[PDB]
């Protein structure tokens, strides 16, 4: 169950681009809030078409199942509006944006021990999902959205949260799971059915690869055709940059999907780097 949100309680100030068959807009809720004081809330909109009508419903069946969870590392949804030609997902605006971007835009100017606290905060947030036996399926840095930068004189870290899943890898084109190839496992290349939550083991790798990368992307110079030869020949992501966390990259990234460690063993491993 999503709270309603009226339409005539969202509006939308600025158009920011596209995810996997979304508009994202950043937008302000006029809500009514504790002790009844009226709140203009800025919000982040995902906007799904009405006439995609499989592809709204996997968005908003992933938003709304993980949603069901409370996690101080998992994105925090505050209703939909369904109320238009159009499905949206209103929720909270986290203000540093994608993990990704954020290291681009600061020059990968930031320590080990700065990446390893973003990763231990999302293993505990997959550890937090496998209990619940949720597979999200789509992890990577842009959906590891920054709350808070690191505060030196406090001692504060960075602290992240974990987006929703957006549309699923099951009902996805097959042509978009080969683009997202090294985060889509190859047991998922091979049959999208294959979906299991040792898949986000696998991403988890991937994602481990691009925060130590610097926002890098693996194999960008590799077309879809040459990413599937890549999984063919069971090729395995170079090391990182920083290359503190490459084996427990390599460990996550394995190809037999029963062999990849729970994430309380990834933490564990963290936890002794
Ligand atoms: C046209 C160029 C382009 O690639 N645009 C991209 C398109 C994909 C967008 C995206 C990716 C993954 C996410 F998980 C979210 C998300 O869920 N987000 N992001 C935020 N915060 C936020 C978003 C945008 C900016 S921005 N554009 O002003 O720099 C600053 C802060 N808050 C929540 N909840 C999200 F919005 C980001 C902009």
Redesign the pocket.
Known sequence: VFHKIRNEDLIFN??????TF?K?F?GVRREVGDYGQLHETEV?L?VLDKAHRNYSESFFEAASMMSKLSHKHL?LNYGVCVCGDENILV????????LD?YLKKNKNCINILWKLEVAKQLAWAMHFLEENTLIHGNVCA????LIREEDRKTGNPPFI????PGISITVLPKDILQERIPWVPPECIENPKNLNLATDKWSFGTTLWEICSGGDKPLSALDSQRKLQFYEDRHQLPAPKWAELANLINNCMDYEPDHRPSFRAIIRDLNSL
């Open positions: 600025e158009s920011l681009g596209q995810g979304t994202i950043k982040l995902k994105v929720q909270e605006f986290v203000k540093f944006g994608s971007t842009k959906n590891i959205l949260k974990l987006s929703d």
